[PDB]
Structure 1
Amino acid sequence: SKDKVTVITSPSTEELVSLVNSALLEEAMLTIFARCKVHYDGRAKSELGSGDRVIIVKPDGSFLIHQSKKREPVNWQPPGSRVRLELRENPVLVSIRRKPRETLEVELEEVYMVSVFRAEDYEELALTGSEAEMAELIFENPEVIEPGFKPLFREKAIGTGIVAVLGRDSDGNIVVLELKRRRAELHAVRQLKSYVEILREEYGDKVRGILVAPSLTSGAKRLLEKEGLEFRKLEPPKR
């Protein structure tokens, strides 16, 4: 019975059903290559005409449909969904999501391959260069901002919003940082500017916003300078 992989090319309906249902029940990865048509209804609504795609169903209920291009799936369902195979004029893979109600229907016109991959993964990703690690860097070593900077809070909620880092300078002013792990764009400045306005209410005009990022878009620089805010160039560190 059980090897990591079970493949059948150009399978019978009996074989299809056999494997598909076995995948769902054994909680393993179903992969399929097929000519299909897709029907999605949910937050938005979509239609995809006949063509060959890859289809993946994870044991956690995530459902992917990949065309020959891009990175993103053309259609999907996120983890937690429930899938059932339905026999009709053609077999149909059907994933239902509750909360929000969403339906994905993959009509299988021709199945070129069905497979069951019983995959064992105990390892999880280890990633460095996050903005969280920027914050770790700053709290360990505040001078990367400027002399006498005193970081105090992280992900601190002010009244409306949550600021990346809140602290004080050598003059005793409230200081806001918004951090970005890549070049900072207009929404970055809008974030900072938003937090500073709100802080100016309690603490007055003392308050300095600083954008901390490796670089800055032209439009970000403009809006920064128009609003009298500051920029510290900082690269996110790699372990």
Structure 2
Amino acid sequence: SKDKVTVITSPSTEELVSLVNSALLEEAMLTIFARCKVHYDGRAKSELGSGDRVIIVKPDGSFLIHQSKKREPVNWQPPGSRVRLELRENPVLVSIRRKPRETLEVELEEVYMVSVFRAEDYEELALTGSEAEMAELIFENPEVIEPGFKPLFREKAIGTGIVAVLGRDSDGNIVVLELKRRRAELHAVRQLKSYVEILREEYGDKVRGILVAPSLTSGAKRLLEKEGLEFRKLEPPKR
């Protein structure tokens, strides 16, 4: 029980309970391969008929059921649920949460494998090419937006909404930027347009919105043009 991994194929009920319960109390990762039915009631409600899936219960409460396809678990519960194995006509893995109140029930018809992974990880993801990274590049070197641009505020509350960057231009105007790290879609324009209508109300018609992004969709460009907003092409930088 200090070995990183413990594994049992075609486990007996005793062995199942032993590992399942040990991992939950040991703050370790539980992985299971089983034919199962799944029952979810919570924010929404779902039923999943009998079939083979991979099941993961992380020490933080995260509960995953993965089918042989997609990138998303077919069913899940997010970090913070309380999980318990429950012996019934079949074993039943049960995830409970109270805000919001949600129940996830996994019923194990046949467990092919149960396993305990006592995983030691002190390390964190270091990612670049984000919106945050664009915002940094614009404050270090405002030249990328345009000559004379002076950035002032990052993630600024206005009365309704939060603007990514608020600044001033060489004509002394108020400028709003909305940044997108990938091709900007319609809703980016709605955001930007919303912010700009709001500030025009205090500061006048001279306020400029600019959408900053590596490209636009057609609809983006269309609404951006209909509304008299602007576009500066900027790629998110990779450190």
TM category (shorter chain) comes to over 0.9
Once the two structures are superposed, the pairs formed by residues 6-155 of structure 1 within 5 Å of their partners are: 6-155=6-155
**Partners in 2 of 1:183 and 1:158 — Cα distance?**
25
User: How many residues of Structure 1 are paired with residues of Structure 2 in the alignment?
Assistant: 239
State the 1:128 CA deviation: 0.2
Report the secondary structure of 1:220's partner residue: helix
Shift of 1:164: 0.3
The SS at the match of 2:96 is strand
Aligned partners of 1:202, 1:86: CA distance in 2, in Å? 61
In structure 1, distance between residues paired with 2:58 and 2:88: 24
SS at structure 1 position matched to 2:54: strand
Separation (CA, whole Å) in 2 of partners of 1:65 and 1:165: 40
How far does residue 215 in structure 1 lie from its aligned partner after superposition?
0.3
Aligned residue for 1:205, secondary structure, equals coil
The Cα of 1:180 is off from its aligned counterpart by: 0.1
How far off is 1:126 after superposition? 0.2
Q: CA deviation at 1:64?
A: 0.3
Q: Deviations over 1:166-217 (max 9, x none)?
A: 0000000000000000000000000000000000000000100000000000
> Helix, strand or coil for the counterpart of 1:60?
coil
Could you report, residue by residue, the CA deviation over 1:33-61 in whole angstroms, capped at 9, with x for unpaired residues? Answer: 00000000000000000000000000001
**Alignment RMSD (CA, Å):** 0.4
Deviations, residues 136-160 of structure 1 (Å, cap 9, x unaligned): 0000000100000000000000010
CA distance in 1: counterparts of 2:83 and 2:229, whole angstroms: 51
Paired with 1:159 and 1:26, the residues of 2 have a C-alpha distance of 48
Structure 2 counterpart SS, 1:219: helix
**Shift of residue 10, structure 1, vs aligned partner:** 0.1
Runs of 4+ aligned structure 1 residues displaced above 4 Å come to none
* Deviation of 1:8 (Å): 0.1
SS at match of 1:191: helix
Q: What TM-score do the two structures reach when normalised by structure 1?
A: 1.00
Identity %: 100
Structure 1 gaps of 5+ residues are none
Q: CA deviation at 1:98?
A: 1.2
Matched position secondary structure for 1:221? helix
Partner of 1:207: 207
Please report the TM-score for the alignment, with normalisation by the length of structure 2.
1.00
Alpha-carbon distance between aligned partners in 2 of 1:60 and 1:159, rounded to the nearest angstrom: 37
Where does the alignment leave 5 or more consecutive residues of structure 2 unmatched? none
Q: Give SS of 1:121's match.
A: coil
Q: What is the rounded CA distance, in whole Å, between the counterparts of 1:27 and 1:198 in structure 2?
A: 49
Deviation, 1:72, is 0.4
Q: Give the Å deviation of 1:2.
A: 1.6
SS of residue in 2 equivalent to 1:206: coil
SS in 2 for 1:23: helix
CA apart distance, 1:225: 0.3
How far apart, in 2, do the equivalents of 1:129 and 1:57 lie?
Answer: 31
Between the aligned partners of 2:172 and 2:71, the Cα distance in structure 1 is 48
